[PDB]
Every structure is written in C-alpha cells, then in structure tokens.
Amino acid sequence: FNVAHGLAWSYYIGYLRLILPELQARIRTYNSQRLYILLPLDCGVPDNLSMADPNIRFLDKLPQQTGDRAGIKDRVYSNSIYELLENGQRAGTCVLEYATPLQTLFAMSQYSQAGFSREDRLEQAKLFCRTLEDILADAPESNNCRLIAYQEDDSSFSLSQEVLRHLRQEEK
Amino acid sequence: VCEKGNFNVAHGLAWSYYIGYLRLILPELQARIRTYNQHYNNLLRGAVSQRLYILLPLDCGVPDNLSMADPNIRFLDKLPQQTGDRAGIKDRVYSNSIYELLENGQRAGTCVLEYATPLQTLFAMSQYSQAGFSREDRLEQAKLFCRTLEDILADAPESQNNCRLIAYQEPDSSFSLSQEVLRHLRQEE
Numbered sequence: 001f002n003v004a005h006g007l008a009w010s011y012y013i014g015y016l017r018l019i020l021p022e023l024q025a026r027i028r029t030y031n032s033q034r035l036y037i038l039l040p041l042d043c044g045v046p047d048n049l050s051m052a053d054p055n056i057r058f059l060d061k062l063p064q065q066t067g068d069r070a071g072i073k074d075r076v077y078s079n080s081i082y083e084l085l086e087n088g089q090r091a092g093t094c095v096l097e098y099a100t101p102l103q104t105l106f107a108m109s110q111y112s113q114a115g116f117s118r119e120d121r122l123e124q125a126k127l128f129c130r131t132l133e134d135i136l137a138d139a140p141e142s143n144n145c146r147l148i149a150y151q152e153d154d155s156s157f158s159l160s161q162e163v164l165r166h167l168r169q170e171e172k
Numbered sequence: 173v174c175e176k177g178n179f180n181v182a183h184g185l186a187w188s189y190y191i192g193y194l195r196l197i198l199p200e201l202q203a204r205i206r207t208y209n210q211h212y213n214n215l216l217r218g219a220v221s222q223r224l225y226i227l228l229p230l231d232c233g234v235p236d237n238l239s240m241a242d243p244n245i246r247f248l249d250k251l252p253q254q255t256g257d258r259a260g261i262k263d264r265v266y267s268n269s270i271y272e273l274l275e276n277g278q279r280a281g282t283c284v285l286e287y288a289t290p291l292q293t294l295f296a297m298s299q300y301s302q303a304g305f306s307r308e309d310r311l312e313q314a315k316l317f318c319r320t321l322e323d324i325l326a327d328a329p330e331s332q333n334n335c336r337l338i339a340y341q342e343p344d345s346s347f348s349l350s351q352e353v354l355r356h357l358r359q360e361e
C-alpha cells in the first residue's frame with residue numbers, strides 16, 4: 001500500500017529471513033541468543049550505538065556470514081556484540097543493531113525529490129514496525145529476534161537500561 | 173487507487189537503493205576500478221569498464237549466481253572492498269564483482285555487473301499472500317522502480333558517468349544476457 005510496506009518486506013526478504021536461521025549457530029561458534037533490533041520511531045539511527053548511549057559499548061563482531069546474491073559473489077552479513085553498562089560495570093551482552101530501513105525513511109524526509117514530509121516519516125515508521133511485526137509473527141525463520149519499538153530531548157530515557165530491562169525480562 | 177500503491181511501494185524501494193547503497197558506493201567506485209586496472213589488470217583489451225552496470229529484468233527474475241545465467245558471463249574477481257559502520261553494525265561490507273563477457277570464444281568486455289537487489293523484494297511481495305500484490309502489480313512496480321531510479325540518478329551528485337541501468341524483458345532461452353550487456357558496453361566505447 002505505501003512506502004513502509006516495501007521497506008518492511010525488503011528487510012525480511014533481503015536480510016532477516018537469511019540471517020536468523022543461521023544466527024544461533026554463529027553465536028555458538030563464538031561462545032543472549034537472539035538478535036535485538038531497535039526500532040526508534042523518530043528514525044534517529046546513529047551508525048555508532050555508543051553515540052546513542054555511552055553505556056552501550058562495542059565488544060566484538062560475530063563470525064561473519066557471506067552469500068552470493070543478485071550477482072555479487074560473497075556479499076557479507078556481519079553483526080556486532082555489545083556490552084551494556086550499569087554504574088561502569090557490565091550488566092549484560094547481546095547482539096544489537098538498529099533496523100537500517102528507518103534510515104531510508106529519515107533520508108527520504110530530507111530529500112526534496114522524495115516528496116516526503118516529517119509527518120509522513122513518523123507515520124511510515126509506525127507502518128514499518130507494524131508490517132515487520134506482522135511478517136515476523138507468521139515467519140518460519142523467526143524465537144530468534146526481539147523487536148524494540150520506542151518513541152524517544154528526553155533526559156528520562158536510557159537506551160542501555162531499556163535493552164537491559166528486556167534482557168532481564170527474557171531470562172525468566 | 174491500487175496504482176497509487178504500486179507507485180508508493182516502488183518509490184520507497186528505489187529511494188532505499190539510492191540512500192542505502194548507490195549514494196554510498198558510487199562516489200568511490202571509479203577510484204576502486206582505476207586502482208584495480210592499474211595494479212591488478214594490465215590487460216590492454218581487458219580493462220574493467222568505469223561504470224557500475226545494474227541489471228533490471230522487468231519481470232524481477234533475479235538469480236543469485238549471475239555467471240550461471242549465461243555461459244558467456246564468467247566471474248573474474250572482486251573489486252577492493254568498502255566497509256563502514258552502519259546502524260550499529262561495525263564494519264558492514266560493500267563488495268562488487270567483476271565479470272568477463274564472452275563472444276565467439278573471445279573476450280568481448282569486462283565490467284562490474286550486478287542485479288538491482290530490490291527487484292527480489294518486488295518478486296517476493298507478488299509471491300506472499302500477506303504482501304498481497306499480483307503479478308500485474310509486480311510488473312507495474314518494476315517499471316516504476318526503474319523510472320524512479322533513473323529520475324533519482326539523473327539528479328544525483330554521486331552519479332557522474334559511473335552508473336548505467338540495463339532494463340530488459342526476458343521470457344525460452346534464446347536470450348543472451350552477455351549480448352544485452354555488451355550492447356550497452358560497446359555504445360559507451
């Protein structure tokens with residue numbers, strides 16, 4: 001129906017359905033077991049997670065995954081392991097990243113030729129989350145990942161604490 | 173009304189292909205190609221062409237192995253890679269593949285070649301009932317994707333005679349993909 005639908009399907013088709021089946025095996029080769037995907041509704045997606053929260057610190061790369069796709073021999077799929085600090089001490093570790101298509105929504109709202117307002121961006125970000133959630137709820141490849149959608153100026157927000165709440169909630 | 177949705181889907185995917193890929197690799201492509209030719213490929217009739225050739229089959233049929241789509245396309249090598257930190261993934265890799273194009277047993281061309289990856293999403297959405305698009309929708313979205321991508325690249329600062337779209341219809345296997353590419357390649361020289 002709209003922009004977000006194609007973006008959510010492309011994220012499943014071109015990425016999640018390919019890496020999620022192999023993820024637990026890659027974590028074993030390394031050794032939480034799931035891919036945590038951050039879904040900021042404002043589409044603010046820093047390339048460096050420590051820029052969002054200094055208590056989120058890069059630890060290691062997972063063993064990389066490569067495939068032939070669309071005529072590119074061995075295109076690389078990599079994921080990053082992060083530690084989450086509480087009072088300067090590690091409180092948890094997980095494979096963590098932002099949903100990259102939220103950057104397409106953000107940049108589209110910034111390019112005049114895309115004809116795409118800020119209101120469009122927020123509405124399409126929500127539709128992106130809803131579509132992706134609806135796809136993953138029925139997808140055979142997915143308890144392999146956890147989506148965290150949130151609406152961020154707000155000194156009361158700690159992204160590291162929020163991920164930690166999910167990690168702790170998951171354990172039980 | 174349903175066409176407005178075909179437009180919006182194709183519109184968003186072409187922008188994602190520009191925003192998340194082409195605007196990031198096109199500025200440095202010709203440096204990577206020049207470097208490769210100067211240091212690794214001193215073949216006076218085998219220079220890698222200076223443009224990214226992007227295949228747009230209008231039925232969105234995209235195989236993952238390009239060389240197996242035509243006896244006369246052979247994988248040769250990869251360009252030097254590009255990595256970057258992307259959305260919290262440290263050192264996400266961008267790589268591109270070089271092919272030789274064969275004709276009458278001879279080498280007729282050498283180029284960086286790949287399919288436009290979002291066409292696979294167009295195909296899948298016509299295949300999955302949750303996405304709810306028909307084959308006729310897919311064909312329309314593919315045309316709109318191509319036209320949007322051409323419009324974007326025509327205005328894009330990162331595209332300066334370094335990218336060429338190859339759009340074609342392809343059913344029977346009379347069709348030669350190498351011949352399709354070689355026609356555009358020869359038109360450049």
Ligand SMILES: Nc1nc(=O)c2ncn([C@@H]3O[C@@H]4COP(=O)(O)O[C@H]5[C@@H](O)[C@H](n6cc(-c7ccc(COc8cccc9ccccc89)cc7)c7c(N)ncnc76)O[C@@H]5COP(=O)(O)O[C@@H]3[C@@H]4O)c2[nH]1
Pocket residue numbers: 010011012013014015016018066067068069070072074075076077078099100101104188189190191192193194261264265266267286287289290292293
């Ligand atoms: N030819 C080409 N080479 C690239 O390196 C490249 N990077 C982006 N794009 C396209 O540009 C637009 C915006 O990209 P965006 O980052 O905004 O959204 C991405 C993103 O969230 C996520 N996702 C995608 C990649 C990725 C990695 C490699 C390739 C090229 O070979 C392939 C090899 C093996 C299997 C393949 C199976 C299917 C297709 C290709 C395959 C292509 C994609 C990836 C990764 N390595 N790590 C983390 N997440 C990743 O899935 C979203 C939609 O992916 P999609 O496949 O549809 O294509 C993209 C999108 O249509 C590229 N196209």
